[PDB]
Design a protein around this nucleic acid. Structure first.
Ligand SMILES: *[C@@H]1O[C@H](CO)[C@@H](O[C@@H]2O[C@H](CO)[C@@H](O)[C@H](O)[C@H]2NC(C)=O)[C@H](O)[C@H]1NC(C)=O
Ligand SMILES: *[C@@H]1O[C@H](CO)[C@@H](O[C@@H]2O[C@H](CO)[C@@H](O)[C@H](O)[C@H]2NC(C)=O)[C@H](O)[C@H]1NC(C)=O
Ligand SMILES: *[C@@H]1O[C@H](CO)[C@@H](O[C@@H]2O[C@H](CO)[C@@H](O)[C@H](O)[C@H]2NC(C)=O)[C@H](O)[C@H]1NC(C)=O
Ligand SMILES: CCCCc1nc2c(N)nc3ccccc3c2n1Cc1ccc(CN)cc1
Ligand SMILES: CCCCc1nc2c(N)nc3ccccc3c2n1Cc1ccc(CN)cc1
Ligand SMILES: *[C@@H]1O[C@H](CO)[C@@H](O)[C@H](O)[C@H]1NC(C)=O
Ligand SMILES: *[C@@H]1O[C@H](CO)[C@@H](O)[C@H](O)[C@H]1NC(C)=O
Ligand SMILES: *[C@@H]1O[C@H](CO)[C@@H](O)[C@H](O)[C@H]1NC(C)=O
Ligand SMILES: *[C@@H]1O[C@H](CO)[C@@H](O)[C@H](O)[C@H]1NC(C)=O
Ligand SMILES: *[C@@H]1O[C@H](CO)[C@@H](O)[C@H](O)[C@H]1NC(C)=O
Ligand SMILES: *[C@@H]1O[C@H](CO)[C@@H](O)[C@H](O)[C@H]1NC(C)=O
Ligand SMILES: *[C@@H]1O[C@H](CO)[C@@H](O)[C@H](O)[C@H]1NC(C)=O
Ligand SMILES: *[C@@H]1O[C@H](CO)[C@@H](O)[C@H](O)[C@H]1NC(C)=O
Ligand SMILES: *[C@@H]1O[C@H](CO)[C@@H](O)[C@H](O)[C@H]1NC(C)=O
Ligand SMILES: *[C@@H]1O[C@H](CO)[C@@H](O)[C@H](O)[C@H]1NC(C)=O
Ligand SMILES: *[C@@H]1O[C@H](CO)[C@@H](O)[C@H](O)[C@H]1NC(C)=O
Lengths: 775, 774
RNA sequence: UUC
RNA sequence: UUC
């Protein structure tokens, strides 16, 4: 079907709308640019390789390049792999880019460059030099960048990539880049704001440096600036998980009261970790457009109770005041200034790490008439006492976040305490949807009762994950939560003694009781798995990692359940050969379409398991079970089966004729098994098959009988990588078909490889030439 | 060094005292008895193989056999592997055993046999036929067993191996085996006690059957019986995790009040799961040597407050009344009859599953003057309230077990609820420190010193698996002046204060593993230097805490010998460029054992080895994804004797091991990616005694890399599951492996050629390379 | 691969 | 393999 096989080890894409020819050679263990890159290539990506040099020959034919991404071919040693350290910095020979008349974007980050590469074409609009060893900027090295708009110079001098001197920038080095819009000088050991900067700037990143003071005229001309980030100058170093040097005498970053006067267009001001003790209202006199203000990791605990500057911020959308607590102080309560009531546009307020014992309703009164408020984040505050009914006055909010507290009767796990949360990787560049969410996860709730939720009938999602709840629920504990659609009860100690647990949550659609194994681990204890009968709109049930090996009831029942996750239990014990009592455990989940019973130690499946499945089962995972054998003909009982996941098991064979085992199967996942050959007529007449994963097995040969064209050409994807292909003359059909098929097969360039014979070991089958088999 | 390579795929051992030649072929994937078994073989084990038959040829030369263990060569289908189902039962041809004149133990369990094999030698003293399909015993099939002493016939008819009929035993079938001492008919669908049994019986196992009634004389003549087990006849089926049929009409096993009168020697009586509602005192009138009584899993809740029968048991050592609760009843308290006070000899009392809300000191008063009591087990009772000070009156006890309760302000995990806890396999803790209070798996969310009032005698406290989410400051355990062992694992310890635990001045072992909760949230203070104050601490476990940050940069202890730090994030703590924690363990000056496996250490920054404490002997870096290793930095570890690098991604060994460590005895490199050894790898590494290179990708090993003067000192050399290429280049290695004195495991099964073509799959021990010497 |  |  193909006349010319693609042997280039890069992915090639065509989006002819934008007439882009996209060549992506990311992470291909290349030591030179591969031959035969399309002449029409516009976007060429070579990041994460070991190409030691660039020369005029590098891009000789590729005159239409608009973007070269040549990052991370010589990463600085602390930043890069310690098993493949770059021995010598990337060599860029003269004239390598001057011929590239249409080049708009050049990324050379992570190559141990010592200077700004010269000879760049005047079409260039974006240059990226992060994670190099360039720490002196001279105006003469920037003359070539007359038309530049975006300049990334950061991460060239910091603790992971030291230069052992202060960063140097010549006076007015950037002034004559009259088109410059984005300047990033982060993580660079800079000591002063470089001046004078071009007045076209819209974004200026100076964070994680050694700037001790702002001059009153440092930002005088920047009347188009929208984003300014000065964070991490005079850092707050307490509990920093990176080497951190504070400004002497506990001093803050010193910012004159009029330093921001020119910045009428400013939308984002980031002053995180500047050891600030006050926020002068005068800072904001001429900024009436500010939408985002980050004041986290300062020393503003007192200021939060005063906060006159908030009166100047009526258009503010997002305010972050997290981690401003005074060292060694555990306050009694949270003192929020009345000034917070003037934040009329506020959507998001975060005050983690204020550290106080008791939250009381009146303490939130400055927020009552903030009509656009959507997120209130009070996590990581060691709160011990909180009457949850106070949120009856916050039904308009989307998320109330009290996660990680000590209450008892979406941001990443590392966020406020990382060095540079915006840093680029070498490779690239949740229940809120249900409605109002109260996040009580990771607290100390050991016992719950209905009155705890009084006046909270509006809640749609309650997150109780990771509390200490070791209690037999009987249907009385959540009675006010008449509207709840999603309950996360994971990581507790639920005792399913009563089949009436949760039945007061009459609108519940999703229940997560995963990782409640405690009471399932002790022998002889009653467990009622049939508690689902009473939940009349329950769509999804998660009970993963409960170690369930016994059940008092023999059947689960539901007229609504569509999805059951039952991973990490002991169905091998429940289904011990000779014990027929639980072979219909799921049969009466009449609407069940998706069943995950992976990781259940099922080394075999007893007869009756498939007959006992509910009638509309479509998607079954038996992954990671150590399955050693499988009666494929039993799939005939699953008349609606469309996806079968058997990955990560110990199967050695496929059925003689897949089509004779299931008339419905679309998606078959067999990756990571022990299969060494396919049956002679494996896929014969499997007209419904659309997706087949045979990767990471031990297959040596595949003949055409096993893989008929009329089936192969309906496949959306066929995965064959990481097998044991034997590239002898017996393999001529397979090698030819793989080279010439239009079926999608990933990793042809990297992991569809001959293991023999001797000559061809390690060779890609796509590059294989077998003419000697045709003499 | 050997002149004749051992090619037999069995382990051969000599005990020349008892002049036993022990040949063990367990689980060697044999389809025939191998040729060349020593003619002097006395013990031959063939269990877990696929030998389809036995014939006179089988043991024809092996005239000196005293024991044949030929179990599980055709396991019943439900009991065996479903990936290798035996297609047809073991065939035993006539005359196969009659020549074995010295044969005394024959194990034929697990072979789907249909009858008792005949032609057995008159020497036989033990015959084992478990897990077969023999469910009718006729006296004529047993005449051959005149001298037999031990007869195992169980597991021939039960739910995992059904026969679909009642078991049949002919009248007096066993009577004329006048030497029979042990009879096991368990798990067999038996309906009546077989009579008459020979009076030589010392042990009789009738449990898990369908016996509804004992007759008055079922045990009339058995005055030599020491163990009787009738458990599981009329079972209590509530929450049974196996198919369980109770006797009809809620009946118990019906035992006449005089049924045990003849049993003057009886020491062990097991009546577990017999649905008993009463225990008649008259049962025990003529047995007062009884030492062990199991009454668990009956309906004896009422009886426990009465229990007049206890007055007849003054020699009882061990009593079990667990799981006697009435269905759907949550009692307020435990009513123990005064009769318990007469159990003068009692060492072990177990009453799990009584199910009551509150334990009060008065309820235990009948036990106050039992001077030999050692174990009180009240686990799995759903107790909510218990003043722990009440155990001030039980300081003589070894273990007080309140585990798995709901308290708030060694037996296996499956024991009382398994079908047959004594069943055979085909193939085959802090009590030591003193008084132990086991509070594990309760609901304790907060602790205070007064909780431990009057418990200063405690040597080991187990708080594992409670709900303790608390910053300890050194005040919480003040009364426990003698505690040597604290298990605080699986809680939510908050190490805010470096004074945590410092009141436990005698503490030698601290387990704070699986307390990750407060370590998983960013920005929180943690004081890892809390070890300073514990001046006799020898062992500290802080596994699986996800530790990735620390406010203190050094831990110090002047006593700690063992630190377990597995399952943390030293990769984050030692992030390249951050030098602050590279001495975290340096000031544990007496540290000898350090486990930092499972720490995501894909590399070790320079300075980690310099930062190790000076006396480190045993270091685990296993399961780290380590991709590179500067072997020369081991020079800093001047006392290193064990280095565990298993389950990593290393590709090379050092060029000269001897230049890396002058002391290293034990190098574990299993489960890595090593594809060849360096040219002079072990040259002059005279101190090495143990090298595990198994599960790597090694193709060839030459004598340059493996000098004989080093290899022959090894206590063990592990090489299995590699990538061996058996060409003429391999002549030295193959010859050395065949003739070596050094122990190499799995030679018979997994030291194998992968090529070339001819030899693929062939064991190197059997390899013949004469064509290389033509 | 007798639990 | 810039976090
Ligand atoms: C940032 O610049 C400072 C100097 O401004 C560097 O500090 C010097 O480092 C060298 C070698 O480490 C020392 O000998 C000097 O005494 C230091 N000077 C001062 C004033 O401290 C620092 O190393 C630079 N940071 C990085 C990450 O390169
Ligand atoms: C080798 O076989 C003999 C014969 O069965 C085993 O000896 C028995 O050992 C037990 C251990 O207490 C004694 O009670 C029996 O009376 C012995 N039987 C005799 C002496 O005939 C011996 O244990 C076996 N050894 C091995 C290693 O398999
Ligand atoms: C134990 O014996 C009983 C009979 O005493 C067996 O039960 C019979 O089983 C057959 C086939 O399943 C039925 O047709 C009979 O009706 C049953 N009889 C009775 C009285 O129930 C039982 O199968 C045997 N148990 C085992 C494990 O084999
Ligand atoms: C964002 C807070 C980081 C520092 C910290 N760490 C902890 C911790 N591990 N546990 C606590 C438990 C209760 C109260 C405060 C803290 C605490 N705190 C706050 C704290 C407040 C007060 C004190 C008393 N000096 C010590 C610590
Ligand atoms: C060994 C006990 C097996 C049965 C059982 N299972 C549980 C369980 N999962 N949680 C409980 C929680 C509190 C009290 C009793 C039980 C209980 N119980 C005891 C029990 C259950 C039910 C009742 C009647 N409400 C009384 C007592
Ligand atoms: C291709 O390069 C252009 C110019 O730098 C850029 O705008 C576009 O996003 C790139 N597209 C892809 C798919 O890389
Ligand atoms: C809150 O703090 C501010 C400034 O510290 C103070 O003026 C005010 O009185 C405080 N209010 C309360 C209720 O503590
Ligand atoms: C919590 O506040 C609610 C709402 O005003 C009130 O009804 C209730 O009494 C309070 N409960 C507690 C325990 O303070
Ligand atoms: C509940 O909170 C836990 C703990 O932070 C989190 O992992 C989980 O995703 C949350 N659940 C939902 C449904 O958002
Ligand atoms: C459920 O339990 C609660 C708390 O123990 C109790 O108040 C209520 O009476 C119980 N309800 C039923 C129907 O058992
Ligand atoms: C669950 O099963 C038990 C029997 O084990 C029964 O008592 C109970 O009524 C059942 N509950 C529901 C809701 O079906
Ligand atoms: C099948 O279910 C799995 C979850 O186990 C899901 O990830 C996958 O996308 C589903 N596939 C289809 C085709 O529905
Ligand atoms: C399998 O194939 C045979 C022969 O073609 C046919 O009789 C049988 O009905 C088939 N079974 C299924 C489920 O397709
Ligand atoms: C403490 O109890 C746990 C849980 O039952 C047990 O696993 C652990 O071994 C015990 N600790 C000691 C030191 O015995
Ligand atoms: C430790 O904390 C407990 C409980 O909070 C308190 O009673 C005690 O005074 C504290 N001890 C010290 C030495 O601070
Ligand atoms: C542990 O270190 C902290 C500071 O990091 C110090 O305040 C504390 O006293 C130290 N404690 C011990 C026992 O060394």
């Amino acid at each position: 079907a193909r006349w010319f096989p693609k042997t280039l080890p890069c992915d090639v894409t065509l989006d002819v709308s934008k007439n882009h020819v996209i060549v992506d050679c990311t992470d291909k263990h290349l030591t030179e640019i591969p031959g035969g890159i399309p002449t029409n290539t516009t976007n060429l990506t070579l990041t994460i390789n070991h190409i030691p040099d660039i020369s005029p020959a590098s891009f000789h034919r590729l005159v239409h390049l608009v973007e070269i991404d040549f990052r991370c071919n010589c990463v600085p040693i602390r930043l890069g792999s310690k098993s493949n350290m770059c021995p010598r910095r990337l060599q860029i020979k003269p004239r390598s880019f001057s011929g590239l008349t249409y080049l708009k974007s050049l990324y050379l980050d992570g190559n141990q460059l010592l200077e700004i590469p010269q000879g760049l074409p005047p079409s260039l609009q974006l240059l990226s030099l992060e994670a190099n060893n360039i720490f002196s900027i001279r105006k003469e090295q920037l003359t070539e960048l007359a038309n530049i708009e975006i300049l990334y110079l950061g991460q060239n001098c910091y603790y992971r990539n030291p230069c052992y001197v202060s960063y140097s920038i010549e006076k007015d080095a950037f002034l004559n880049l009259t088109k410059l819009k984005v300047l990033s000088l982060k993580d660079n050991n800079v000591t002063t704001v470089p001046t004078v900067l071009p007045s076209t700037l819209t974004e200026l990143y100076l964070y994680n440096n050694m700037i001790a003071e702002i001059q009153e005229d440092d930002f005088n001309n920047l009347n188009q600036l929208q984003i300014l980030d000065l964070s991490g100058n005079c850092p707050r170093c307490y509990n920093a998980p990176f080497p951190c040097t504070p400004c002497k005498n506990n001093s803050p970053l010193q910012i004159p009261v009029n330093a921001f006067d020119a910045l009428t267009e400013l939308k984002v001001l980031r002053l995180h970790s500047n050891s600030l003790q006050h926020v002068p209202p005068r800072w904001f006199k001429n900024i009436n457009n500010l939408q985002e203000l980050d004041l986290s990791q300062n020393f503003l605990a007192k200021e939060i109770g005063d906060a006159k500057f908030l009166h100047f911020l009526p258009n503010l959308i997002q305010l972050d005041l997290s981690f401003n607590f005074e060292l060694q102080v555990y306050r009694a309560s949270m003192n929020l200034s009345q000034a917070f009531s003037s934040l009329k546009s506020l959507k998001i307020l975060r005050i983690r790490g204020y550290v106080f014992k008791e939250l009381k309703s009146f303490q939130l009164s400055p927020l009552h008439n903030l009509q656009n408020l959507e997120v209130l984040d009070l996590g990581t505050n060691f709160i011990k006492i909180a009457n949850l009914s106070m949120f009856k006055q916050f039904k308009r909010l989307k998320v109330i976040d009290l996660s990680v507290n000590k209450i008892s009767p979406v941001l990443e796990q590392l966020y406020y305490f990382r060095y540079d949360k915006y840093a680029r990787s070498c490779r690239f560049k949740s229940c809120y949807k249900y409605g109002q969410t109260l996040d009580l996860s990771k607290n100390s709730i050991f016992f719950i009762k209905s009155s705890d939720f009084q006046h909270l009938s509006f809640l749609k999602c309650l997150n109780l994950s990771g509390n200490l709840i070791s209690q037999t629920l009987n249907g009385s504990e959540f009675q006010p939560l008449a509207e709840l659609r999603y309950l996360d009860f994971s990581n507790n100690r639920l005792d399913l003694l009563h089949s009436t647990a949760f039945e007061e949550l009459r609108k519940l659609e999703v229940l997560d009781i995963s990782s409640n194994s405690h009471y399932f681990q002790s022998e002889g204890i009653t467990h009622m798995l049939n508690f689902t009968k009473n939940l009349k709109v329950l769509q999804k049930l998660m009970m993963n990692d409960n170690d369930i090996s016994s059940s008092t009831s023999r059947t689960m029942e539901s007229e609504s359940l569509r999805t059951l996750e039952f991973r990490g239990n002991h169905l091998d014990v429940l289904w011990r050969d000779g014990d027929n009592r639980y072979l219909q455990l799921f049969k009466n989940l009449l609407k069940l379409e998706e069943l995950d019973i992976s990781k259940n130690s099922l080394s075999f499946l007893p007869s009756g398991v498939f007959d006992g499945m509910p009638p509309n089962l479509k998607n079954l995972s038996l992954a990671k079970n150590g399955l050693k054998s499988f009666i494929w003909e039993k799939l005939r009982y699953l008349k609606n089966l469309e996806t079968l996941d058997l990955s990560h098991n110990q199967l050695t064979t496929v059925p003689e004729r897949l089509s004779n085992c299931s008339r419905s199967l679309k998606n078959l996942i067999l990756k990571n098994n022990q299969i060494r050959s396919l049956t002679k007529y494996f896929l014969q007449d499997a007209f419904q098959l659309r997706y087949l994963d045979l990767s990471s097995n031990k297959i040596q040969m595949i003949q055409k009988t096993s893989f008929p064209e009329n089936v192969l050409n309906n496949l959306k994807m066929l995965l064959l990588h990481h097998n044991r292909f034997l590239c002898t003359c017996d393999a001529v059909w397979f090698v030819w078909w793989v080279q010439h098929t239009e079926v999608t097969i990933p990793y042809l360039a990297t992991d569809v490889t001959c293991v023999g014979p001797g000559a061809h070991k390690g060779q890609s089958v796509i590059s294989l030439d077998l003419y000697t088999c045709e003499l």
